[PDB]
Amino acid sequence: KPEPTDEEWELIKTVTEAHVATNAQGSHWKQKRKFLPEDIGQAPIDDLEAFSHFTKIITPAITRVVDFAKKLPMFCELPCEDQIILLKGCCMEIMSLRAAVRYDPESETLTLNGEMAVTRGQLKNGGLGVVSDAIFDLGMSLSSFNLDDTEVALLQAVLLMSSDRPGLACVERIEKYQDSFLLAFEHYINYRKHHVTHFWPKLLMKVTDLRMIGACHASRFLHMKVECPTELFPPLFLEVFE
C-alpha cells in the first residue's frame, strides 16, 4: 500500500508547519484551559450577552485561519478574489475542526482558542443551535482516529481548496491543488497504519460532516439578524459569516 512520494513529503511538511505555527497555544493548550462559568448559556425560560461574548471569542480564531492559509504557497498563488471566496467557504469548517480535535471526554468539553473549555449546552444556547451538537458529536467520534498535526493540517487544506465554491475563477487550479492534498493525505494515512478499519473512507465521511457544519450558516446567522443592529459584532465576524 503506497506511502508518500518525495514531493508529497515536502507538501506534507509545508502544510504541517503552517498548521503548527497557527494552532492556538500550540501544545500548551492542555493546561492553559479556563472553563467558561456555567452561568453563561443554559436552557431558556437564547441570551444576547452570551452570543456577543462568543462573537468576540471567535475573532482570534478566524485570524488564525487566515494566517494558516497565507502560509500555503499554493493558496497565495491565487487571485485575491479567489482567496476571499475560499476563506469564506472554509473558515467555520476549519475552526470547528480545530475545536473538535481538542475534545475531552472527561469534562465533555471543547476548548476554544486553545484556552476556553465550553460544553455542548453553552455553545448550543450561546447561538449555534444544532451545529453545536454537530461539532461535539464530531469531536466524540474523532477520539477514535488519533489524528496528529499533519492529518489535521491536510484536512484543513482539503477544506480550504474546495473548487466548488461560487464565483471562483480558476476552478481547475483549485481542483488540482486539492487533489495533490488528497493524494498526499491518503498516502500518509497508509504509512501511519491506524488500527481502525477502513480509515480512509471513514475520514472521507468526516470531511462531509465538516462541510455540513460549514454550510449550516446561511441558517444560524439569519438566526441573529432579527433582534439587533449589525454594528454590534466585530467587522471580521460579519465579513466571514454573511
Binding site: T63, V66, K70, C80, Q83, I84, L87, K88, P235, L236, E239, V240
Partner: peptide, 9 residues
C-alpha cells in the same frame, strides 16, 4: 469585503 482584502496582503 474590505478587511478580508487587506488581511490577504
Amino acid at each position: 469585503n474590505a478587511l478580508l482584502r487587506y488581511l490577504l496582503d
